[PDB]
């Protein structure tokens, strides 16, 4: 008997969604595959609406299948994978997958990527590891996974703590598992939410303008993430505006433009004095995901920093 | 006789039996006696700010200083914080007309901490500035025993002493026992080969940076447009793509004469011309391998020469 | 009250062994530190004798202390760390540490490395993770840890599955733990052994000579590890000699000269037909360590391959 | 008109509506029709062996072939297995006298497998060989959309399609939409700049490779010495250090005229001269950034010109 695997498509086909078993016939060797098109967007236009639709669809469909494969554009797959990692309560494998080359282009990466994603979704050993991304023969956790290169087929890496397992000949040797709390160990429950808190991201650099930061504060954003320089440091005029945000009802999280390493609490900036949160290893777009969800439960920066310290 | 090397300091000491004085750079030199073995060192404290508050006016003061003092010394080392070094290095790479080595240096640990990186990093920067073979390679960054070109160099890790790398095209050479095996030189045009001359400039064109992500707000890109910014750099997703509403604001801006450069939040690889975005229809410029903060430096300088998007693209193709 | 930490020195001082608390006085803030010089060799001369002396000394001294820090030259620290990972039955932190710069050289890395190693040995959270290496603000597992660069202070990486935790301001955020069985979950017991099986390593390349391989076979080695090309492939004349070794009493393990990735069982070479074992992610010098210990229990290649599949 | 490019095949097809013939390289070309868009392609099957059984005689046949046929074509692509490509590429880098592009290519997946890398890799190798800007950069490796110099290129991962990298000095350029932005060229002397001429050679000097590790046996290094090998490369620990008993055998050998090169099992960085080992006392040569298999290629060729350890070191300093 082979596992039942639901492929949820968010966009264009990566090898329509009901044809994938004929476009990649090897799938019939490993699974009984059923396809649903949940939405159809370019990944560069991903949004909160699509996030909620997916977490609700997986949590509702958990009983109907043995595992999920989500097909998704590469540009924001790291964002969607972490949102799902925190909001999904289904304990069955959820595996995200995309393609750095078009399906019609030479040596297209989609077919094998889809095959390997199905392998991962079918593997008993894949349960209880949080939401996964499978790209380039590798199983990565939805928390640390990011894109490292604009075009490379091998772009997706877990740049801080590394991959969970490598896939060879339809087999996974898992050697690691994310200790950070995920899926049904989080208190984030989006079953009844139809919007998320307003969180924007502002960039730091030499002679940075406070205008982006002031635009979000004047819009009344619930949250702002700073893509800091070095260990989450802030250009003076940005630092001034955020200091104002934090004492007037905008949660402020210090992340980093630097691609690897933690932004560490009270090391470069007096977080306690300013009412700021340090993102740790969460890059600015991941720290947005968790800020949004922290803001569904609390606006107390000491409670948001504890959230940033276990999820 | 030993070469004459100037240290130009922009902030704190990265290193440090001697009396501490009021001048940071004078304590620095006493903190690293072995410098006497390789150079006649002279320090000047140009400014004293944290690198997280680096700005246009420090960039103008340094380029002008290096250009003015070129005949006075055999080389320059600049002590600089790590957070924005990659931006200042590229600025100086495009605007220095001196063909003597200009080497930037910093440290990821405090000078007081255990196993402070600053003292050795400074020694290796002076080694580099003293090497006749360092000349005509552009402005350089020397960190963790490695020579990095100012164009491609970036910080990869928030705390690692080894964070500085040329993430696309790799290092120029490695330093062992005070000697450099140079195997590489940047092909993009730099220093006396660029048309950018900052010698009479008081100020630089205004260029802001917007981030793209899921559900991105247009409000940062609108704020820059309403302030009438000369240029905006987009930190795009994947190969420079933009969120729909950010796209919409920047498409309108380009139409009314804002210069728009697509860069990427992705830490390696080119944002390539007309690939994910018809740059020709919109009047956008692709940044190449330049990261958002690096593309800002080139866009500011491009805008001193031209406001035409097609000439700006050819600039982003040559420098 | 502060933890009791035993520093075992194998060689020259990295900041004599009883002075380290005065050379790095910050240690008195985190631990009560006692030093023993177990042996004094250059790490390039490391050997089986020194291995057994250490595992016996730690297993015997486990009751007398809260944790161990071993000071060791960088050239073979990856070898000693895995030997100890497999042979130590003490459940208290054992942390290996060295220095890529001399203690007397400018910006010497030893002091902080020693401090951070003591931090790791003192951390409750460090128990039960196997034998650790702490280099360059990073906690790495003794299985995957290797040197990547001849001179860099940041050389030590876990190149396949990544680090366990990063150390900031005397604090570890552990986010990973090796799933491979270690310490008291292995059957390797060296308490009564005074030598180990004879295992040598032979290199593959274009026009490789069979002479190295034939020298080990004629010496009657218990084991040979091949540093294969690509996915553990063998130059014809090497392949011929090893095929002969395996059917006449020499266990043969296929590793790789390639610095990352597994040598995978029966993918490039018919392991079952030749009586060979595939090393997986174990590089040639690590696969030697585990072959030596597998050979203390069995000479059946199917039993050695199962050993290579869980340790 | 399109450039004329020769494919020289050494084994299996890396790619593959057509009739399959007995000649691998003829099936290869039919398997990648889009080649017609960029080149007039002509294939020759030079040899047919697995790359794990690469040898001196294939290296001699290829260099001689490229050198002989240089006037007949605009460029060369060599199809080669991945396991030893890095060795053949460097051999050809030192012995090709043709200054037209020579591009090596392979594939990490089977041509039959899903998402086979071979077809696109071959297209990108032909693109590279067809680019006038590829010339005078040495023998090249093109894999996963990247141009790598034959000196520094190596395989980093047993299975990854992205395994090939220039791990010390980085890539020469990246390929996007059939176009290469070259930002780098190898400074070490290659091709028509080396003194190695293989045109009359029937065979190469015998050079073996010994591994170092804890408790290393001397028996491999003794076997090579007793066979009277012209040279031995040591895969040292850290910065080329040797286990005591391996040291002992190689010290004795060097004394009786065996050439001894210290390389390292460590996958990046230089093995540096008189640093961890007094090379002057022992008559040893430091390999630099060359890995053991790369140092063997240069040592074999060094030994066609000289057996003096000091001249061999200067060769390891220049090529």
Numbering used by the authors:
A (entry chain B), C (entry chain B): 0 to 14, 31 to 326
B (entry chain A), D (entry chain A): 0 to 15, 24 to 326
Tell me what the authors wrote about this structure, in their words:
The genome of E. coli encodes three L-asparaginases, called type I, II, and isoaspartyl aminopeptidase/L-asparaginase, respectively. The active site pockets of these enzymes are shaped by two protomers, one of which forms most of the active site scaffold, including all catalytic residues; it will be referred to as a “major” protomer, with the second protomer called “minor”. Yet, as we demonstrated here based on the reinterpreted structures of EcAI and the new structures of EcAII, under some conditions a citrate ion can be accommodated into the active site cavity and even displace the canonical substrate or product.
The remaining five structures of EcAII describe its inactive variant with both Asp90 and Lys162 replaced by threonines. In the first case, EcAIID90T/K162T-apo7, diffraction data were collected from a crystal first transferred to the cryoprotecting solution and subsequently frozen at 100 K. For the second structure, EcAIID90T/K162T-Asn7s, a crystal was soaked for several minutes prior to freezing in the cryoprotecting solution containing 10 mM L-Asn. The active sites are very similar for all protomers in both structures, as well as similar to protomer A in EcAIID90T/K162T-L-Asn50, described earlier.
